[PDB]
Amino acid sequence: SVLQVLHIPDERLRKVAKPVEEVNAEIQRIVDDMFETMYAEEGIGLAATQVDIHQRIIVIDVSENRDERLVLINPELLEKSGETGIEEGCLSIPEQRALVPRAEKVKIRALDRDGKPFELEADGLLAICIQHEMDHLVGKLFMDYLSPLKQQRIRQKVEKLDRLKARA
Ligand SMILES: [Zn+2]
C-alpha cells in the first residue's frame, strides 16, 4: 500500500521515533509500504515518521531500477567527517529545495529487513540522504538549518501548494 506522506506544518513531523523492539512481519510490511510510498512519490529515501509511524525505520534506494534498496532499522551514527551539501528536497516539504550543510562521510550501524545488524560507510549522495532521513526520526527538517526568514518563506509557499492540493 501507498501511505499518506505528512507535509508541513503537521506537528507529527516533529515527533521523536521509538526504536523497533522486534523486526517481525508487521515491521516487514511497514518496510514494503514505505518502499512503495517512496517510489510512488519519486523519493530516494523515506523515514517512518513522515508516514505517521513513529519508529526508527528508514528506507532508501538511489539505484536506477530498484535493484539496490537499502533498509536501516534502529540506525546509529558511529562516525562522521567532512562537510558538503546539495540542494535537497523533502517529500514532507513539497517543491522546496535548499542547500543544507551535511557531513561528507558517515559510518552507521543498523539492522536490515531481517533484523540483522550491519555497518555501512557512506559518502556522496548516500551520506547526505542517510543524514536527512535520520533527522526525520528525531523530528528535524532540513529547513531547520536555514535562517528564520528562509523558513518563514518555505512555510508560506508550501501552505499555498497544499491550499490547492485539496484541489476540489
Ligand atoms: Zn525529508
UniProtKB/Swiss-Prot annotation:
One of its GO terms (cellular component) is cytosol. GO terms for molecular function: ferrous iron binding; hydrolase activity; peptide deformylase activity; ribosome binding; zinc ion binding. Upon overproduction is isolated with 1 Fe(2+) ion per monomer, a Ni(2+)-bound form is as active while a Zn(2+)-bound form is inactive. It comes from the Bacteria. It catalyses: N-terminal N-formyl-L-methionyl-[peptide] + H2O = N-terminal L-methionyl-[peptide] + formate. Its EC number is 3.5.1.88. One of its GO terms (biological process) is co-translational protein modification. InterPro entries: Peptide_deformylase, Peptide_deformylase_sf. Fe cation binds at residues 90, 132, 136. The keyword Cell division does not apply. The keyword Secreted does not apply. Keywords: Hydrolase, Iron, Metal-binding, Protein biosynthesis, Zinc. Inhibited by 1,10-phenanthroline. Belongs to the polypeptide deformylase family. Removes the formyl group from the N-terminal Met of newly synthesized proteins. Requires at least a dipeptide for an efficient rate of reaction. N-terminal L-methionine is a prerequisite for activity but the enzyme has broad specificity at other positions. This is Peptide deformylase. It comes from Escherichia coli (strain K12). The lineage of its organism: Bacteria, Pseudomonadati, Pseudomonadota, Gammaproteobacteria, Enterobacterales.
